Ligand binder design. Structure first.
Ligand SMILES: [Cl-]
Ligand SMILES: [Cl-]
Length: 164
């Protein structure tokens, strides 16, 4: 199991534009297009992303290219983030994947706001950060996903993803 397999599971794969769980426009493997209400604005963003006239549709190959670019950017955002970096540097390989996952989903900014859980993660207080993480809008809006990530942080293994 790896970050790619992990997020593919959590985000799914869709070849047509679609609304995410907050009503935003996305496509591919969790690729956010626009926080705006226009399907047109989204088709515009999409073509610019793809570099061609899509018409709201991309190939698997295309979706995977956005995917690679997005995982890369998440990793680099964490590395450049003064609040995230040290957390990330203190964790083991599985747990780093769980941090990239949250970052991919909600942006560096959003994650950097989990100040208290970040502190516990840094201190290796597993079970307490797990409880802290659960007390969030994030866990309330997408609980199943939140639970897989959170278990990952708790146990340091891929258990929550095996089967899926
Ligand atoms: Cl992009
Ligand atoms: Cl969910």
């Amino acid at each position: 199991m790896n970050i790619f397999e992990m997020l593919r599971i959590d985000e799914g794969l869709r070849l047509k534009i679609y609304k995410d769980t907050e009503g935003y426009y996305q496509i591919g493997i969790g690729h956010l297009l626009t926080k705006s209400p226009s399907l047109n604005a989204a088709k515009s963003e999409l073509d610019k992303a793809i570099g061609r006239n899509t018409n709201g549709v991309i190939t698997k190959d295309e979706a995977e290219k956005l995917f690679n670019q997005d995982v890369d950017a998440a990793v680099r955002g964490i590395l450049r983030n003064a609040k995230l970096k040290p957390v990330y540097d203190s964790l083991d390989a599985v747990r780093r994947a769980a941090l990239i996952n949250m970052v991919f989903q909600m942006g560096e900014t959003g994650v950097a706001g989990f100040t208290n859980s970040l502190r516990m993660l840094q201190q290796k207080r597993w079970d307490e950060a797990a409880v802290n993480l659960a007390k969030s809008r994030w866990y309330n809006q997408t609980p199943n996903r939140a639970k897989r990530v959170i278990t990952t942080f708790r146990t340091g293994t891929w258990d929550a993803y095996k089967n899926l």
